[PDB]
Design a protein around this ligand. Structure first.
Ligand SMILES: CNC(=O)[C@@H](NC(=O)[C@H](OCc1ccc(-c2cccnc2)cc1)[C@H](O)[C@@H](O)[C@@H](OCc1ccc(-c2cccnc2)cc1)C(=O)N[C@H](C(=O)NC)C(C)C)C(C)C
Lengths: 99, 99
């Protein structure tokens, strides 16, 4: 579809059988979700953004559905104020910026 | 043009007669630029990012050219790791997300 930016580009995503709201963020290199439980091993990591860095748990090869489109990739879990879908997954669903 | 997301969507912007690179950021409500000098009075604003909140200087009706597209709007100046072109300006140049 074509999503305008008059409002925040929020979409529904499905991960681990849970339905959640997330922001399509072209400014984010990675995907970061609110604290939740995921299967498998994880690695500690620090990610920075506006306001500084936060500590997150890194899980690889996680399956996520974005507006029907399935995508696999790394997902970071931590104290983020909003769920962020970054470029690592945006590319997988063929999302592009146009003007 | 059509921009893919395999790399950061960095573009060249012109402001105050100078060229700088910035990120087309759909995850940002506002446009935030690294410390610089701008004309006029400024007002205070507190913005929140992934790592917390930071104080910035708000300048209004600032002319900024993004990839040949002229825009005039509000720009925030503060301690940001990178220049960010937010939705307030992306809408002015007709930018949309597609997939
Ligand atoms: C390498 N690091 C990244 O790639 C990081 N990217 C960013 O932070 C992007 O910024 C560019 C950027 C790129 C690289 C580095 C970097 C770092 C270290 C080293 N090198 C480069 C630093 C910044 C984002 O799109 C940013 O813009 C946006 O984040 C999403 C968001 C939206 C709403 C609330 C939110 C907060 C409070 C209430 N409601 C919502 C909280 C967060 C955000 O903070 N939006 C704000 C917003 O819209 N707030 C409402 C505006 C005002 C900026 C990711 C790991 C998340």
């Amino acid at each position: 579809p074509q999503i305008t930016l008059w409002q925040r580009p929020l979409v529904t995503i499905k991960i681990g059988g849970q339905l959640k709201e997330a922001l399509l963020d072209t400014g984010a290199d990675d995907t970061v979700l609110e604290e939740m439980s995921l299967p498998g091993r994880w690695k500690p990591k620090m990610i920075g953004g506006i306001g500084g860095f936060i500590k997150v748990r890194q899980y690889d090869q996680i399956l996520i559905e974005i507006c029907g489109h399935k995508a696999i990739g790394t997902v970071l879990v931590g104290p983020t104020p909003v769920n962020i879908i970054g470029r690592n997954l945006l590319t997988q669903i063929g999302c592009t910026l146009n003007f």
